[PDB]
């Protein structure tokens, strides 16, 4: 162990009576001292704790304001086909969100390591499928933040970013619907379409935001804090490496980024995709409702203005066209409401099945995702697994 620690420092940072024991304790003491010195050298030369803090802030979503701002800025961009995304442009958007959020207050050495990575852009891909945070690990810190650990951190970052992007898309849809209700107050027949869009977007936002909360806090943030504490408590470089690897594996498993949670990750991704579909449908419905409301408001304003000018407020041809437009708007509003209800029901079914899988998942973060997705027990009413998991295990351990 001593020689291994020395090699890591170099490359990365009674004898007459009982000969067998006379040097054993001395060898062990020298080993301990050498390993501690190697770990201290690795820390001082490779800024292992600073790299771990950068990983926590970016790849573990510890800089929650930064992740929020990135997702909010990406929502109008990430809805576009990824084939139109420029990696330089995505990095610039990330930098702009940093400058617009508390991420600007991070140290330049940390902020320079937090970046936007664009995956290979395919047609039809959204930003949620290709956006990830990354954390570059090198030198002695790369012994703790191994390529596997860095891949797990990037997986958690991308998952949280996609979920937050979908949440913010649905929140923008619902915000548009709610705000336009004030505009559409003069078009009450269209108000219901906006409300349906708001409801569907609210369900999708709730699902995506609960998944993101579980991944970023219960898995990513907690595992990052555990990694940092273990590294600060590490006695040798190998102990730091093992503790960071275990932390990264725990984060991957609870964020569903490990190999064993791959089915859970796929189900969560399908839930996120259905949430994004619901968000997009709600945004389209709300856009149509707001356009109809604006046309009705403009028509009413023109009528009032012509009446004030002493002209016949609307011509019989213009009045018939206005009545036809209002009729078509009212007939589309029940149709928009039905479409939004269908989208909401599909999304809710997918979310319920994802929550059931999460509640049955071995990862605790997935059970917390299920509990958040069913905080009012809507999914728990729909997914039996969320009701059973908390009830079933506590009864068995009380019988011994």
């Amino acid at each position: 162990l001593i020689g291994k620690s020395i090699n890591f420092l170099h490359q990365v940072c009674d004898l007459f009576t009982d000969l067998e024991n006379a040097f054993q304790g001395k060898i062990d003491a020298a080993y301990f001292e050498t390993s501690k010195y190697l770990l201290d050298v690795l820390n001082k030369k490779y800024s292992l704790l600073d790299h771990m803090q950068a990983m926590r802030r970016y790849l573990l979503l510890g800089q929650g304001d930064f992740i929020r701002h990135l997702m909010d800025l990406l929502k109008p961009e990430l809805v576009r086909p990824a084939t139109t995304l420029y990696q330089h442009n995505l990095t610039g958007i990330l930098e702009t969100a940093v400058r617009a959020t508390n991420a600007q207050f991070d140290s330049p050495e940390i902020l320079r390591r937090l970046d936007v990575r664009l995956l290979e852009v395919s047609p039809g891909d959204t930003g949620w499928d290709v956006f990830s945070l990354d954390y570059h690990v090198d030198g002695p810190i790369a012994t703790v933040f191994t390529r596997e650990c860095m891949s797990h951190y990037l997986r958690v970052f991308n998952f949280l970013w996609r979920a937050k992007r979908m949440e913010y898309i649905l929140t923008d849809i619902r915000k548009g619907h709610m705000c336009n209700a004030k505009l559409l107050r003069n078009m009450p027949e269209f108000s219901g379409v906006l409300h349906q869009c708001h409801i569907l977007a609210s369900e999708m936002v709730h699902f995506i935001h609960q998944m993101q909360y579980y991944i970023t806090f219960e898995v990513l943030e907690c595992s990052w804090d555990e990694l940092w504490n273990k590294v600060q408590q590490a006695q040798d470089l190998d102990h730091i490496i093992a503790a960071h690897e275990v932390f990264l594996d725990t984060i991957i498993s609870r964020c569903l980024l490990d190999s064993d949670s791959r089915a859970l990750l796929n189900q969560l991704r399908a839930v996120f995709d259905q949430i994004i579909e619901l968000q997009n449908a709600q945004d389209a419905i709300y856009r149509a409702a707001l356009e109809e409301l604006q046309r009705r408001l403009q028509f009413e304003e023109k009528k009032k203005q012509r009446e004030i000018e002493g002209q016949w407020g609307v011509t019989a041809a213009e009045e018939e066209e206005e009545n036809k437009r209002i009729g078509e708007f009212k007939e589309s509003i029940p149709k928009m409401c039905s479409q939004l209800r269908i989208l909401t029901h599909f999304y809710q079914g997918i979310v319920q099945q994802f929550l059931v899988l999460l509640t049955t998942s071995s990862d605790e973060s997935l059970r917390f995702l299920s509990f958040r997705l069913d905080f009012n027990e809507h999914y728990k009413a729909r997914e039996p697994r969320l009701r059973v998991s908390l009830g079933t295990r506590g009864r068995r351990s009380s019988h011994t």
């Binding site: 506590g394 351990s397 019988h399």
Partner: protein, 330 residues
């Protein structure tokens, strides 16, 4: 020091030996709602959470090993749990370990017991047999407290009868007396558990742990402590424990009948329903009194054999008005 034997023993006394009587009262008050459910519908984890919350809100929080103390919901009733504990030292231990949980729907209040997590080397002393005996004693005392709580519930329902005219409350009088007899039985069982079982067993455990000379001596002292706690909680005598469990069940049925009769009297055919409920409560009270009288008779025999004035004082505590003395003699 390393295995915190004294801290574990104090935690076990607070939780498993019911030395922290306020903790057990709080836990049963919290868990009573769950205990009203059928045993199959009772969530053991909810009773465990209520136990841990009573422990943290009571002086059991002062035990440094209290966080190693866990709540265990016994799969069997107090009589069956006691019989299993009595079988532990017998060749029937394997049969009682494999014994199916007692089909009698134990209330969560009556099924509630503590377990204690012992680290090595103290796990040599707090063996599985000692933990099982502590769990049996805990379950027995918890069942007594459940019966007390049921009698108290009947009493609360009967308090409204004081506003009714004597003539209108007459049919409640039998139910009120049955509830009173059930409450007296449950309270005397609790008094036994508290002043003859819990406090003496905790003091014996602490003294034996203080007098241990070696880890095998510590194991012997812990086993003696557990056996004393089981014996004084009536868990070592299967006939006494069976009689106590039957008496508590009859008391609970009497209390429910009395509560129904007092509710009808408060509402007041209602008088006829109240009188029928009172008669049923009186019959349950009779059965409970019979089992209590058999227990008292056995206690009297034991006090008479050894000339132990202490046991006569215990009997005088349990039978201060002599109600159970004549029934035991009968």
């Amino acid at each position: 020091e390393e295995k915190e034997l004294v801290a574990h023993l104090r935690s076990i006394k607070r939780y498993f030996l019911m030395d922290q009587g306020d903790f057990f009262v709080h836990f049963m008050d919290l868990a009573e709602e769950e205990l009203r459910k059928p045993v199959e519908d009772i969530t053991p984890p909810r009773l465990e959470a209520l136990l841990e919350l009573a422990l943290r809100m009571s002086t059991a929080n002062t035990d440094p090993f209290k966080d190693d103390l866990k709540i265990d919901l016994m799969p069997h009733d107090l009589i069956t749990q006691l019989l299993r504990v009595l079988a532990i030292e017998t060749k029937q231990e394997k049969a009682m370990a494999h014994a199916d949980p007692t089909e009698l729907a134990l209330s969560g209040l009556e099924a509630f017991s503590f377990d204690y997590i012992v680290k090595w080397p103290l796990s040599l002393i707090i063996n599985r047999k000692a933990l099982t005996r502590y769990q049996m004693l805990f379950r027995h005392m918890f069942y007594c407290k459940h019966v007390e709580r049921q009698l108290c519930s009947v009493w609360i329902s009967n308090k409204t009868a004081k506003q009714h005219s004597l003539h209108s409350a007459q049919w409640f009088a039998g139910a009120f007396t049955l509830r009173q007899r059930m409450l007296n039985f449950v309270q005397n069982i609790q008094y036994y558990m508290m002043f003859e079982v819990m406090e003496p067993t905790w003091h014996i455990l602490e003294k034996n742990l203080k007098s241990a000379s070696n880890i095998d001596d510590v194991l012997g002292h812990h086993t003696g402590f557990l056996d004393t706690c089981l014996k004084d909680c009536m868990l070592t005598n299967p006939e006494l424990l069976k009689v106590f469990s039957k008496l508590m069940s009859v008391c609970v049925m009497f209390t429910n009948c009395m509560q129904k009769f007092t509710q009808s009297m408060k509402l007041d055919d209602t008088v006829q329903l109240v009188s029928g409920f009172e008669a049923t409560i009186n019959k349950f009270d009779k059965n409970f009194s019979a089992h209590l009288l058999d227990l008292l008779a056995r206690l009297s025999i034991y006090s008479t054999s050894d000339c132990e004035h202490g046991m006569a004082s215990v009997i005088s505590r349990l039978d201060f008005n002599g109600f159970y003395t004549e029934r035991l003699e009968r």
